[PDB]
Amino acid sequence: ELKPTVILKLLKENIIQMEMIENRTMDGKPVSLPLLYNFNPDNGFAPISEVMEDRNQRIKEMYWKLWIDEPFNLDFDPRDVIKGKDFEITAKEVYDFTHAVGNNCEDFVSRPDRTMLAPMDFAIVVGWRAIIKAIFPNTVDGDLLKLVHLSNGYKMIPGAKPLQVGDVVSTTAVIESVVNQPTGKIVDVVGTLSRNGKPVMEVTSSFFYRGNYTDFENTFQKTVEPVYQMHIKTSKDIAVLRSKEWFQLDDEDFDLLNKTLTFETETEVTFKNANIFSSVKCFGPIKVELPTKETVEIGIVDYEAGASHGNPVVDFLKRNGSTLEQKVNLENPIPIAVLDSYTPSTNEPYARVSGDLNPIHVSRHFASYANLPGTITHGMFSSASVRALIENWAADSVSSRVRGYTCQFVDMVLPNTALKTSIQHVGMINGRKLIKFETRNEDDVVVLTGEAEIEQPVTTFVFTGQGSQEQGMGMDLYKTSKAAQDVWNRADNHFKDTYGFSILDIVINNPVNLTIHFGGEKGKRIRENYSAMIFETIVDGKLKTEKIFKEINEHSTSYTFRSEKGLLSATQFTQPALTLMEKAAFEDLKSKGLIPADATFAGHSLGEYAALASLADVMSIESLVEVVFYRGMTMQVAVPRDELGRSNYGMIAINPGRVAASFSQEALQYVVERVGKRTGWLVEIVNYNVENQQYVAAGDLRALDTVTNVLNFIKLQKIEEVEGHLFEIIDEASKKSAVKPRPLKLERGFACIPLVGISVPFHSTYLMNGVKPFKSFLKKNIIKENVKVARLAGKYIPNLTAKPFQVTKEYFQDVYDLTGSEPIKEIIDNWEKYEQ
Amino acid sequence: NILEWLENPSNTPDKDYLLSIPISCPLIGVIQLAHYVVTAKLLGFTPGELRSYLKGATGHSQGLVTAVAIAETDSWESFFVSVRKAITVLFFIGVRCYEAYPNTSLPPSILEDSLENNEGVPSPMLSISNLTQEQVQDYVNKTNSHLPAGKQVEISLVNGAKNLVVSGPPQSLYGLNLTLRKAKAPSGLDQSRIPFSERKLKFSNRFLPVASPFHSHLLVPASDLINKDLVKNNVSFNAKDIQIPVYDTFDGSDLRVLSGSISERIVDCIIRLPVKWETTTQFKATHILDFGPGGASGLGVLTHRNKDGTGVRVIVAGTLDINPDDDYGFKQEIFDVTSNGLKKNPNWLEEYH
């Protein structure tokens, strides 16, 4: 329909009033912007003069009537936080927003037996009244008709689910930073959206009052400086740090030498003029990097100064330390897709759905007065359409997979225009793919550009335990990656200090024999280290001690490690090497930013230990190598051995599918248990690898020979009564195999593959007596403070209990269902006390 | 604006928007009615006279509305009343079905896999040929067991013994396609040297040009809305007003003898119940007249394949062309006056008796 848009008359005898009416409003009642012009007949060349007094106030009043639904009050402190009204997400609202923006993702569309999510772009809809109210106060003065939205962005807080239909979201805006640059005033606002009290996300919005401003008294700027890192190499650095007043420590006597300090500083600057700050404050925590790669607060940076030309803290940190950039670029960008988006002819539906009733986007006359090329489309519409494209393509139309999205509106966009957006994957940030987008109009002119943080698919990290002990394991990563270098060097230094050998040298060369010598004070210390470690066992409730390295004593001058083919094949050295290469690989991945925060992890055998040291950082490299090396040495004494070192125990790998097509795991377990009980020896399944196709049994190598013979019988033939029939075969195999010498060789069957180099039944009931002393050794190596429940819970799948790690009474009870332990009963019985 | 789109093909909407069911349903109905009008006018019959000459009427899912409307027609004056009822029904079922289960953009990973593996764009309806109903139902049962209750798939159109269509979410149908591809041998495989029993079964699956999952549980909630809104629009079909048999797509029974509402039965057929085309094709007739879309790719050729060898001729009125095999007729055979117009398809039982 046709409605009045402009009314020109004489409010006064000397004043020309041009009421510019905006019929598109919230309640439908028209709102008029009275533009007053003085008329001076004496000045015939330019009789009409703009009335600059109250002009910004009137423009702000009109925009307040259009946007905000509260009484007009421009007198409030910009520093004070703005609290918007509670907003209820509704299916109709989400439907309208999605179909106005052009969001065709299934997550936002109603579907049966499934909840409806809301788009991340709905945050601006929720919190426009709070975000836009930040640029209104009289202290932040400017022309709202000349406002330019420089950029917007959303940041999902980790651990927060995406917005859903029906939830109540509270919005809280605060002016991050208002500054007077020569081209105009830039106002950066941050609006936190919170749900059920918890905070859901943060929305950053940068606006630009184009003009000339000099009210520096009302200008302030908060900026989170980049995280800085300093390695304290000498006492000169310590003296320099202590000479700084701002550098304060809770423990003044803390030893800073050979430590890495991380500074996370926030700078508040109040401007006196364009160049000199009226006051500079720089505050934040200073933390030290523990051996477990965990940053723990040890001090505070607290700089406070009046008139200054800069912040000395940031300059000092930039000059001395290194900048820690979370975003890690890839070697080359990975182009994803080039996509086309057609801007709608009319901005009315988007304006109504988003609540942004800015007249420039819907009224020709207001845009002409603002000197725009036309009724330019909403920059937020362009951002939301692009984000829909990124979530469709980069994130495979998974709403939750998009967590951050920042956009910058470099140039205006007109209705009915073709926008070509090129999506690239450029880097990683904290396990999130960093996707760049650069939109261009029909004229090949960039109109939009920004970043997005797309979570990787659900990731698990499985750490091998029975990998190949080949020479040069992880050496390529040792040459290339710096984190791998650090891990390997720390391990090698610790091994040299403690036991006087180089794990790096062992991996590189794989010597057949290695002689450790105990000459000098260092040699004596290494000898005492060799003598100290002891394998303790519990027999008849008695703590018997077995000294590893029998041929070491006060008079011993050297000890030689003996191996058949190479030392890298030995369990003592192959397991530290495997753990170190896996930890180095994971540290390289983490340095590259390829580790999702929510990624899960598991580990086979000592791969579990590597996984704990990698994902959870429960212990440092120095403790990890100690634990793994001690575990490897304990296999030298855990079973009796003859003079030549060959043990009577062993392991085979059974393949039920090769024996028969209908051989179930239950059938194989039945055979194993009946063989063990009938023959009286020890044999049991230690690894359940693949369902009915890959298992591992451990026990007396002689007993494994009988098991192989029994399965050969079952394969070759078609095989209480069943128990007796199986017992007959068991007796036949038992009296067929026992005749051989004790250190026999296990022949490979049609389905049984003996494991070369294994001589102890680990992951078996045999090593049950040694659990308690080994538990004490593990408690010594693993510190309670270094255990992180957030990093363990829901991500760790123990081999004992193959479920998500959870600190729950059900989990603790499940521990006993497999292996009884008195501390577990203590915790379960006193669970009520611990809960309080 | 059909008239604007037709007058100016330059500014016509894109094919996806046209194929969306709120457009496709009423427009396909209008196309069928246009074919009927052209036939009746060129032959000089009124719609009522042509309908009386017809021994019966029916349709594949959507075409049942047009069939009952044609059965409703009595004269040119009331022909617009019948057309209004048909267009109203088709428009409302399209709108309500789209509202109940609107289309959504699928992952480009799935789209790329489908295109790379010689498959069409995923759609809510997947046609499987050269597979029996038991095997298709077994695959559907596996997919349903491994999918959640809201995303289950089911057989929609039982087009023939070896021709079925499964309707459901495009995601679910893509998963079913993955399973079928895993169970499908290469098309360019030579199996002449293998015994017939040991041969891997080969079949072709393709996504139909449809925008909603017709004859699915997903469109159930739209049924009540359609039923409650057709009475508001004042569109109902009466058995007494209908004067030729119309075969229900589900069981093949005549709609005249149905105690319940014919409009409700048609809506349930289109949105909820499957289309047992073989069951509905049990009528005895010498000639079948296909007014549907697709021409050679339309319902007429499929019906001819289903009823081949029974002596039933099929003539498609939707396009003007020649069939070199001559096993089904075309628009010219309707209006031909010579013996060329009267073609009786071969009856193997009688011809080679």
Added chain:
Amino acid sequence: MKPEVEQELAHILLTELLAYQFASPVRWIETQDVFLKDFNTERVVEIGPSPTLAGMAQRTLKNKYESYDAALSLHREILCYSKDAKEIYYTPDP
């Protein structure tokens, strides 16, 4: 529950699990069932010298999770550090 008590209990549980790991069998069937069916893991990353656990996961998926992956459209990408370093690092060959 207090954070420090939670940390103490988690540490005790972790030490107990690690201690009894070598005295009990490893239930990798249950672990694979967990991280494939319960979590619907879309990409598996195997840190090691050889693709032992990677091949184990591939074979488990082939035996058990075939129609499940098909029906739910789960693109299970099994990656090993030794061979699939390019895929893990996002460094496709140009």
Added chain:
Amino acid sequence: SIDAISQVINIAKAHPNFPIALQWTGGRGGGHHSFEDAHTPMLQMYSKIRRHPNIMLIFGSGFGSADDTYPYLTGEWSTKFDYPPMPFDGFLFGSRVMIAKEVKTSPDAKKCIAACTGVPDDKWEQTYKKPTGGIVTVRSE
């Protein structure tokens, strides 16, 4: 097979006046045989074959009496297969006449042939692995 039937149809098309006798025989037939089923290829290609009146369909490969050929003569053999009736223009009995009085087969060979008890159609495929009905499949030069 289907390709051979297509070639026969092409020959009939090229010479519509000349009569062509398509002597279809499934793999179940005696002597040299293919791997194709006796029934399904006919179900696929019958319409194309009857599209040319000069082709005569003769059905062999497992016929030795009137009782088992009458369904094929009348065409009702296809009614059990969810197909319309499919009459055939003739039949050929190869193995049935191998023990005739006038054939030069030796008396002991005739006794062996009669001793072969045979096997129904659905189990004919079990001859590449083991003998069934006294008949097994071998490979020629």
